[PDB]
Amino acid sequence: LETAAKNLENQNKQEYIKINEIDAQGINFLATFKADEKDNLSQYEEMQIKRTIYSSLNYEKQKINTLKEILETLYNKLQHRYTSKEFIYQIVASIQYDIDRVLCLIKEAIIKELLMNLDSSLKTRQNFAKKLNETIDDYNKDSKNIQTNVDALATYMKENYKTLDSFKPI
Amino acid sequence: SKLETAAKNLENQNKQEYIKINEIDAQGINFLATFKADEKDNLSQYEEMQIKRTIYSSLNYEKQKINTLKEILETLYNKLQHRYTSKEFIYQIVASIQYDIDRVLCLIKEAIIKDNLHTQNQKESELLMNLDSSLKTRQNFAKKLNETIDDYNKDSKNIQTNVDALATYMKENYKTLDSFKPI
């Protein structure tokens, strides 16, 4: 348990320094979301999202940029705006948060079913990553017209990121 | 959102704490050596860091005051008679002040995320009160801790010169974790 905390902690710092490296080159990934005055993308929330995304896409700028275009392209159509937001604030944040929650519960133990809870929530982020990479690949091949047609992109994203629980292990 | 801009001030202050601690530690000052070396209680490097979080903050990152504390806890540790007072301070008082604060930030964060889901059950004022509370505890602690570095260096009530005085004093001044909370 101490060893999990130790490893996971070390993973968190490594992600943090990698995210900062990428963002220093001025790729404002969630720029369009930061600019939104309806919700408030807190600095903290911005950061949690990136942990999942950046890690998922193995810190490859080109890929982060490709996804930026999908989120932005749905964002630029009022009809599908909720789809881009729900992805970020509902799926991606929930995948990330869950990992975090267990690590509080692991810390709370060390200082007073957790290892299968930690197992699960890390695994849920592995299955998301895999799905996301397929999606980046699918986009660049304009499969199901999800590059030329934003209606298709909406359908595809809706269908492929329906619920948090679908990325969980069986 | 006050809750969001609470998460932000703890986040960056957490970070700023981390870079100072690692710097002070870099210079070979072995604050928790004696406690790490202990078989009976495994002290994790997280556990250790969190403890430093409350102590090095409270002593304003001044090495002198840290090694004077080091001198106190090791004096207490090496007199078998009084060795558990050294740990209660470390593990039952220090590690309890720090832990309340990180627990609130876990909860503050949950509430922020759950807001975006539309499933926020946590009352937003309760978390801020709890935040404002545990911060104040650690400052009440910090104030006590500098009193105790001053006294030791002046040998007040024979605290430097008699370990039985020192054990009494630390028990008097660091009795319960609630003894530093506001009212």
Author numbering:
A (entry chain G): 14 to 125, 137 to 194
B (entry chain A): 12 to 194
The authors write:
Two CspA orthologous proteins, BGA71 and BGA66, that are capable of binding complement system components C7, C8, and C9 and thus inhibiting the assembly of the MAC have been identified in B. bavariensis, allowing B. bavariensis to escape the attack by the immune system. The importance of BGA71 and BGA66 in the resistance to the immune system was supported by the gain of resistance to complement-mediated killing after expression of either protein in the serum-sensitive B. garinii strain G132. In conclusion, we have solved the crystal structure of the key complement inhibitory protein BGA71 from B. bavariensis. The overall fold of the BGA71 protein looks similar (Cα root-mean-square deviation from 1.66 Ǻ to 2.63 Ǻ) to the previously released crystal structures of the orthologous PFam54 proteins CspA, BBA64, BBA66, and BBA73 of B. burgdorferi.
The diffracting crystals of the Se-Met BGA7162-251 construct belonged to the space group P31 and contained 18 molecules per asymmetric unit with a water content of approximately 45%.
